[PDB]
Structure 1
């Protein structure tokens, strides 16, 4: 965390997060692949998510969310920057060549770690089935179907706390604040994700948004009646509607979950 001096009117509010033990260039080439941008656009060519476009060219890193090698110890080579996410990634070298990327946990640099059916818990970074993880311990990178890979708690500094256990399932409080029953056959990694000071950085200037591939938001009271329901009016009007999307869905409080096929898996909502 550094705070830039105001030598120009754009650096006045740039709070920058710089890690000096991140690796200095040349990511691990046999484990990257090509990734082109969508612009938020369908296979019908239609903008289906707005405010997406531009940015920097990026390569996709084949980060392992499954952590399948069991019993084979992996040493950590280096922690790298990943353009595709807000977390860091750690290059692991298994005991038989076999480089892979995982999501880096907090406190890793050249440490040892092994995902298995019964690995050491003290080391944060060991992937493990949710049956034999001790209750009360903070985990991240939780699978949600066995074999599917990690899906939950994998942003920067994200974690979930394993709170209870019964039957074939296991209950864990999520970072969202909601209690979620998850199957105990599926894996999780002990610890907490690495780049937890990511919420401190300030972008500073409008260009810093534009090179993350994010594109400006016209707010709907600035549009015409044909463009948005927040219509027009003379002067600054205030959306005489109730506040609503550009497609007419109400936005300030209205619930939009309608899944029903996974409601029993959610033991308590965001409270």
Structure 2
């Protein structure tokens, strides 16, 4: 038949993140010489709200180590970080709530948000609102820290990655219920174009594998294979445990 809405979405024509009222990509300051062999102080000046994100983005300025400017860094804001806090992000940095001292140098059992997997990618993990990681184990013989991602899935990363100290701002967003379709309209209008979700079982059997019939029923089991081709990999993909627990 025709291509399915999910398949007809990696074309990214209309279903492409909007990001016009967004600020730049929020990420740690670039891992230069200064954040390896010392620290550098930076003042938090503005905490804005990138449209389409529950976490506050704090505009942190540092000094450019080499030219004479003041380079300006956009970072996700750990909760509690206020305007004018003098954030330190280096090697010898203190461990106050917001600093970006390296991950294998943070004490164990600590609480770290905006951790980064690879040493330099400027912050990937634990970076949505209220999310964070707990440092569990350091392996100084291997040089790799095992932190516990905000999904239970605890992984090992190198002990030279960087990480903020705290919880990402905007925690507790997901608990205030929406109460109306219109407050879901304005949530996704800063996010991408996936709303409303028409149920594939309410579609025609040309546009979706579930659609069809005189009754709205999924004809065959919803759990589809991991290996199934796109346009078929719809429903519960490689569902290993199924249904209410």
Answer whether TM exceeds 0.5 for this pair.
Answer: yes
| Cα distance, 1:56–1:179 mapped onto 2, change above 3 Å | closer
| Cα distance, 1:117–1:54 mapped onto 2, change above 3 Å | closer
| Cα distance, 1:189–1:49 mapped onto 2, change above 3 Å | farther
The alignment partner of 1:135 has SS state of coil
| Cα distance, 1:55–1:99 mapped onto 2, change above 3 Å | closer
The alignment partner of 2:174 has SS state of helix
Match of 1:131 among 104, 116, 119: 104
Match of 1:112 among 70, 79, 86: 86
In the TM superposition, what is the alpha-carbon distance from 1:55 to its structure 2 partner?
Answer: 6.7
More strand by share: 1
Quick check: 1:147 aligned with 2:120?
A: yes
In the TM superposition, what is the alpha-carbon distance from 1:244 to its structure 2 partner?
Answer: 5.0
* Number of residue-to-residue matches in the alignment: 212
Q: Name the CA distance, whole Å, in 2 between partners of 1:177 and 1:195.
A: 20
| Cα distance, 1:54–1:112 mapped onto 2, change above 3 Å | closer
Quick check: 1:227 aligned with 2:207?
A: yes
What is the TM-score with the length of structure 2 in the denominator? 0.74
Tell me if the contact between 2:28 and 2:73 (Cα under 8 Å) persists in the aligned partners. no
What is the TM-score with the length of structure 1 in the denominator? 0.68
Instruction: Map Cα deviations across residues 168-197 of structure 1 (whole Å, 9 max, x no partner).
Output: 211111111111011112211111101102
Q: Which runs of 5+ in 2 are unaligned?
A: 65-69, 225-229, 241-245
In the TM superposition, what is the alpha-carbon distance from 1:151 to its structure 2 partner?
Answer: 0.8
Match of 2:196 among 170, 191, 216: 216
Q: Which runs of 5+ in 1 are unaligned?
A: 1-39, 257-271
- Within a 5 Å distance, the mapping from 1:1-271 to structure 2 comes to 47-48=9-10, 52=15, 57-68=20-31, 70=35, 71-94=39-62, 97-109=70-82, 110-121=84-95, 123-166=96-139, 167-211=142-186, 212-213=188-189, 214=193, 215-234=195-214, 236-244=215-223, 247-249=231-233, 251-252=235-236, 254=238
Q: Name the CA distance, whole Å, in 1 between partners of 2:27 and 2:19.
A: 24
| Cα distance, 1:59–1:192 mapped onto 2, change above 3 Å | closer
In the TM superposition, what is the alpha-carbon distance from 1:54 to its structure 2 partner?
Answer: 9.1
Q: Name the CA distance, whole Å, in 2 between partners of 1:240 and 1:116.
A: 58
